[PDB]
Structure formats: structure tokens, C-alpha cells
Amino acid sequence: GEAPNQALLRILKETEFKKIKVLGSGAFGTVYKGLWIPEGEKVKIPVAIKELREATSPKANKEILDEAYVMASVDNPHVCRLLGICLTSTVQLIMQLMPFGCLLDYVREHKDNIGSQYLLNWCVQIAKGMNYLEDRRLVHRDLAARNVLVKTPQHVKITDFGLAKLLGAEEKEYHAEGGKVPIKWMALESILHRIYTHQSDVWSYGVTVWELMTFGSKPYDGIPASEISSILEKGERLPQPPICTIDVYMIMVKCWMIDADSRPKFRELIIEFSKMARDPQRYLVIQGDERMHLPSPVVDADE
Numbered sequence: 001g002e003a004p005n006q007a008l009l010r011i012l013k014e015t016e017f018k019k020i021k022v023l024g025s026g027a028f029g030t031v032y033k034g035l036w037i038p039e040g041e042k043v044k045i046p047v048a049i050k051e052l053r054e055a056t057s058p059k060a061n062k063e064i065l066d067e068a069y070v071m072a073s074v075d076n077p078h079v080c081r082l083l084g085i086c087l088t089s090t091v092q093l094i095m096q097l098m099p100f101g102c103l104l105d106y107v108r109e110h111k112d113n114i115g116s117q118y119l120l121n122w123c124v125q126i127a128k129g130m131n132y133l134e135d136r137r138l139v140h141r142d143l144a145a146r147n148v149l150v151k152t153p154q155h156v157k158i159t160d161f162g163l164a165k166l167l168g169a170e171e172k173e174y175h176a177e178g179g180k181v182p183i184k185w186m187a188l189e190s191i192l193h194r195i196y197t198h199q200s201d202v203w204s205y206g207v208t209v210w211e212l213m214t215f216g217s218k219p220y221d222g223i224p225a226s227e228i229s230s231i232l233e234k235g236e237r238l239p240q241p242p243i244c245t246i247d248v249y250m251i252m253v254k255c256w257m258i259d260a261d262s263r264p265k266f267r268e269l270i271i272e273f274s275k276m277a278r279d280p281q282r283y284l285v286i287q288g289d290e291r292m293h294l295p296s297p298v299v300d301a302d303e
Ligand SMILES: CCN1CCN(Cc2ccc(-c3cc4c(N[C@H](C)c5ccccc5)ncnc4[nH]3)cc2)CC1
Pocket: 023, 024, 031, 048, 049, 050, 093, 094, 095, 096, 097, 098, 099, 100, 101, 102, 105, 109, 149, 159, 160
């Protein structure tokens, strides 16, 4: 927070890249698969483009540049970096394509080949990623398996900071307006009085790992997203995943404590899951573990 920032925001024109096919749709704009041939050099790097819907206000235009600022400013193996930005009436955000799609989709598909070593590695990485975002005063606000993308099955990264918010010199929290938010992923305070801290994200981490440990299940399925805070204040919580060791669930439980200050800290979570990563079959019990693959550990980017 004192060194020269020096990030390179590459600005690009809409001729440099063409959209091949759509990946995500929604009122939260459209996101396409495309190719980016930078002006000159004869390379076609495959990218993701997010062409979010037309801005409707100058206030809600200034925030777009903001999402671009940070996404462009971060530098971590497990966090996605903004590759370029295209400033047309409709702003477009260009980013290195993660070809395998999101983790939530990946776990559902290969939900039969995924073994314990992989699951625990993913937890670790996601926490390495978030801890990073913490050492930058950054508050994700939307951690879910849908927002964790797969570069390669052995390497995942966090993405989509549509809601990300920097913290000023003396600031221990963030208060929001009234946009859209995924109640089933939020800490009780977030649902109560729109508060967002790093600890609020930790609760999201837990729901995310829960999502993974259950191979894609919908959290609190069938239960309408209106009375979540009741059951939550009542003390209910997502059930222990069948394959899940008490040792692991107990971490997910600590993550969902009404008291923000009793939830783990990403710093701790890393070391904990890292420890668990060694000797994984002790912490996750999945039929067929002895079988599942391990990670022995036209032109892509990185150029
Ligand atoms: C049976 C599985 N099926 C086909 C394979 N995938 C499809 C898929 C592939 C890639 C992606 C993908 C999205 C994405 C992505 N999207 C995020 C929201 C984004 C962030 C900033 C700018 C643009 C996009 N960013 C980077 N790489 C990405 N890759 C999404 C879905 C899962 C669905």
C-alpha cells in the first residue's frame, strides 16, 4: 500500500477481438467466448469477454471502472486478472479464458472421478486466493462455486468482483445499498444490516466448500430465500456432507457462527486445509478414492 502500483491497464478496440459463442447470459450482461488478436503480433489468445448491460446513470457508470480497476490491479495465482478493457458506449471487460468453466459446473459433471486430493486442494487454493484479496483490503461479497473458475483441474482461480469494494485507511467494514445479492451465500449480518467484511466472505467460503463436498448440491434447496435469516438465527445450518469427515465439517460449522469474530481467518484456513491436503483420505471419505486420479505437482496467454 505504498509502492508504485504500476498495473498495466491495456485498452483495446472492438476490432482486436471477436466473440465466438456465448457462455453466460443474464441481466448482469452477456459473457462470450472469443479470441483476442492484439494489434500487430500474429497470435490469437482465447478470452472471456463480459459485455454487461448499458449503464443507466453516471453514478452507476463510475462503478464499472472501479470493478475494472481492481480486477486489473490484482496479481495472484488464484485470482483472475483483467486482461484488457474496451471502452465503447457499452463497456467490455476482457479476461484470459479459463476453458473448463466454473468449478460448480465442473464438480457436477465429473462428480464421479473427483477424488479427495482434488477437493481439498481446491479448498486450499480458494483460501490462498481470498487471503490475497484480504491483504489488499478487498471484500469480495460474492463467493460461490459459480464464481470459482477452473483454469486446469489442478489450478483454480477466483473471479467476478461485480460487488468488490476497497477498504479505506481506517475501515473495518462496508455498508451496501440495495442491489441484487445471493441471500443463500451471505452471513447473517449481511442479510440483517448489509454488512460486508472479510469475515462475511469467510461465511461464503464455508458455503462454497460445502458446495464442493456435496458435489454440486443446492444449499438449502426448496427453502425460499426469504426466511433464510430465521432458520439461521434459529441455529440451523447446512447438513454434514455424506463424504465429509467431522474434522472437515467442523470447519464449515465454525465458518457459520453468528459471531463474525469466531469464524476462522483465511490465513488459518489455508494452513488447516493444507495440513489436511497431506493424507487426504483421513479427512474425506469417498467410495473409490483408491481409484481417482492425483495431480502430480490457437495460442494461450501468459505471452
Ligand atoms: C458441460 C459443461 N458446460 C460446458 C463447459 N463449461 C462452459 C464454460 C466454459 C468456460 C466458462 C468461462 C467463463 C469465464 C469467465 N467468466 C467470468 C464471469 C468473467 C470475468 C471477467 C470478464 C469476463 C468473464 N472468465 C474467464 N474465463 C471463463 N471461462 C464458462 C462456462 C461448463 C458448461
